Symmetry: D2
Subunit: 206 residues, 4 copies
């Protein structure tokens, strides 16, 4: 099972954001304002490009995955609304300055979808989604008080998002099955890289 494998050889990296400083704070609501606001504007920018990334994947996707991508893009597209509501909730501007670490991650994703194989691309989608599910699972299971950000915690840790993640995992495993060792390694490498980007992204807040 490709998915299990990907997680193992990178458990080392994942262990670093499970939990990360930002999540510990989130859970114990020690987490400061200036920090959340920074994460918000940057992740908002990521989500927008993650939608372009998904749309590029859909264009190269097998016929039988088309319904999946259309539903998934529409589903992920709602996250935008969430970010723009919580921004009119905090009187904060999203059209602000974007951190370099974020553009780096965005551009890497776009390049993979554009020039990489479909496996590498779907592999990156699994990584990124499964990374937020776990990180946010941790925040949920380790929550103390009330977080003025419960909406975000409720979305990425929800059974619904977990089902979405499981659906991706199942598709990924089937794809990998019919692919050789060479192509798998390329995808393994993409997963490693996206794992690093996930870890680095959390530092943007500070």
């Amino acid at each position: 099972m490709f998915s299990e494998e990907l997680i193992k050889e990178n458990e080392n990296i994942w262990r670093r954001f499970l939990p990360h400083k930002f999540l510990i704070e989130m859970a114990e609501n020690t987490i400061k304002k200036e920090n959340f606001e920074k994460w918000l504007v940057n992740d908002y920018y990521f989500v927008k490009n993650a939608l372009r990334f998904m749309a590029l994947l859909m264009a190269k996707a097998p016929d039988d995955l088309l319904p999946f991508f259309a539903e998934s893009i529409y589903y992920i597209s709602k996250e935008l609304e969430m970010f723009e509501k919580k921004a009119q909730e905090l009187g904060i501007s999203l059209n602000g300055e974007i951190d370099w670490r974020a553009k780096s991650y965005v551009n890497y994703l776009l390049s993979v979808a554009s020039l990489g194989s479909f496996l590498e691309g779907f592999t990156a989608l699994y990584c990124e989604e499964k990374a937020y599910y776990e990180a946010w699972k941790w925040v949920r299971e380790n929550l103390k008080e009330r977080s003025p950000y419960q909406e975000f915690i409720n979305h990425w840790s929800s059974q619904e998002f977990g089902e979405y993640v499981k659906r991706i995992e199942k598709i990924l495993n089937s794809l990998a099955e019919k692919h050789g060792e060479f192509e798998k390694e390329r995808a393994r490498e993409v997963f490693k890289e996206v794992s690093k980007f996930e870890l680095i992204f959390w530092d943007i807040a500070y």
Copy 2:
């Protein structure tokens, strides 16, 4: 208004499918099961790739259009279920051999979305959606009795799809306004080429 200039200039091509023989038979219920089947199999293929085309445009689209694309692709994807459900009811396979004209049209849209400007791609989208809205509207306006294919007639001629087309139209006209002659002429040419594809597609039903 760019959308109207596009329509005016390709009027003689559009008049050819408004109505096309296939539409006359749909409206008079004289359509042979054999011809519908061929159109169904080939159009299903087209719909699948039209979604890929849209996904390609989405990735190159301006930030303010991302919501429109996510919604439109989700909306258009429902057509797949419509085709599949209708195929179960008729015991028809959608895995058949695809006509050269269909593959040609598909590969052209894909190339436009991949290598062309966003204006060219969005213009192709408008042409292809507006074309079906007009074609199926004609069918609903001339339908003699209720058709065994009413589901398709209703979907492409509905107020909902009409609003979708209008939404595309508004965006297209705004985009065109901030572009120059050179770029517009490229789009005009794409609109012309897609128009011929739309006209030629109707003939697939009578292939073989």
Copy 3:
């Protein structure tokens, strides 16, 4: 050996253009001016886009192939001048209407290069180059007398072009050996489809009948 496999399973289609009506006429010099002109205008369009197709592959290619693609694109781009020279000498225009079969072949290649795997793309490249190498080689070998289009016959049948084809073959075979059968089948399909396009392209010269 993937390359030989590809050829073996499509030998029926290739036989149809080895030789095709157009090649027999080139070889016997029975080729009418009008037929050559139509082929010229359309192949010139194909070559331009074949360059774009190769550039798309280059962008997706492994580091160790960058030099090959740089050299090949430069080499193949020379063909443009070859078409342009010949067109000047014949007082013929290359700005005319392009045949539907040609656009269809071009658009398929660009779709494979953009949305397909690198393997499928490179397989399409091999097929297209290998097809022309064989066709023009047939022409050089059945040429009764010297042709007014010797330039084209020589370029595609030359030892230099054959080396270029052999170089693509060696790269392809080696790329295939590290892929599975699912992905190989995808490429097999592309090779078949490109083969049909090659066979059909020759008919363009007689279009407008």
Copy 4:
């Protein structure tokens, strides 16, 4: 004239690398071997990808620009040999770890060629080439003694490279002329972005 306009709105960014600390050390022969080696490994990676960037542009290029792209890609590909021989001589490995700012500049370029318009992409080509032409031309106009890296200084400050830049500039100016103010400003933004990337790349060496 588009080119002049691009250079004038980013003039303050350009002055930071005209000269940058790296160029000053190159000119005064005070540059340390560790810093040159890092720049070499990282730029080699950039050159390989710049080639993929150029090929992507070629795929979208107007018919009358195909000759130019074929020649330019061939011309620029020679740089790989230049880097490879220097690395042979220094007993240095090119297969090392590449800085993130480099991969980021690379991925930004790939995204622009993939998803952007042809003008945006060609505006990026001009910026990147023109930036090295001026950077290396500065080093040359300020050289104290003949440098051990004189070969790099000469290739990018050469008449041949300058003619290559001028050829790009002329094509860019014609293109911009037939484009309406909207896609122009889009390209202006890209120029600004590549400018910033050119400036950051010089820091990699340290």
